[PDB]
Structures are given as C-alpha cells and as structure tokens.
Design a protein around this ligand. Structure first.
Ligand SMILES: N[C@]12C[C@H]3C[C@H](C[C@H](C3)C1)C2
Lengths: 57, 57, 57
C-alpha cells in the first residue's frame, strides 16, 4: 500500500494544484490508516497536513 | 501521562473551537516534555503545531 | 552536521523574522540531507515546513 507519508505528500501536491476533491480523498484515506492503527504520530501528522491543505486550497 | 502528540492533538482541537487559553497550556506542556527529552523530532512537531495554533483567530 | 529537524526549526524562526533568504537557504540544506537519506518521514517534514515558511513571507 501507500504509506501515510506518501498519501499526505500526494495530497499536498494536489492541493497546490487546486485539486480539492482528490486532495481531500487522500486525507481521508491517510486518516483512516492512522486511526485504524491507533498511532499517535500518524494521527498528528495527518491532522497537521489536513490544516495545511485547507489553507492551501 | 499524555505524550507530546496527544497534547498537540488536543491543542489543535481546542484552538479550532476557540479556546485559546487551554490550547496554549497544552502547547507549553508539550514543549516542556519535548525539551526535557531532548528529542528533536518532538521539538519540530511542537514548533509546527505552535505555529498552526497561533495562526487561528 | 546539523540534523534535518535542527535546520527546519531554525528556518521557521528565520521566516518568522521575514528573513526569506536565510530561511530558504536552510530549507535547501534540510531538503538535500533528507533526500540522501531516503526517509519518507523526513520528506513530509521538509515538505510541511517548506509550506509554512513560504506562507509567512
Ligand atoms: N513528524 C511531523 C511531520 C510533519 C512536520 C511536523 C509535524 C507533523 C507533520 C509531524 C513533524
């Protein structure tokens, strides 16, 4: 699978392109992985990038 | 007690609601822990979330 | 040399002061170290801090 970091990298690139729907899709999938794993570091990583994407868009 | 990541997750959610005061107190604690452990990953994590929290209105 | 995290923390501080020239110099170094390490966590860290820096100026 893609790692959380690859998913979040691609979301940031898509957000830079103004591609909201595809960016947000990748964020939901990264959040799903982080929450399934109950992984605090993945959770904060996703949470930070979620905010950054919103401001970028 | 709560890890740096957990404190930062809570700080972001309070700041998004509007409660700046307890958000900042969680940032202070997260920073205290990160500096005490002398952990550079935790320090940049705190520093980024500090910026994102202080960014919201 | 310095770690990626150490360069990024300082790049954020320089960007806060409006020193885009110094900030971007340390970002360039942080990115080149992260890229010879093939570290996906360092890559997303560099990417996030790049965006925050470029948002403040
Ligand atoms: N490890 C981190 C990567 C990125 C930058 C900072 C905050 C978030 C997002 C987690 C450190």
């Amino acid at each position: 699978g893609p790692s959380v970091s690859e998913l979040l990298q691609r979301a940031l690139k898509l957000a830079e392109e103004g591609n909201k729907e595809e960016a947000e899709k990748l964020l939901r999938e990264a959040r799903r992985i982080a929450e399934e794993l109950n992984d605090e570091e993945l959770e904060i990583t996703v949470q930070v990038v979620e905010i950054l994407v919103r401001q970028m868009l």
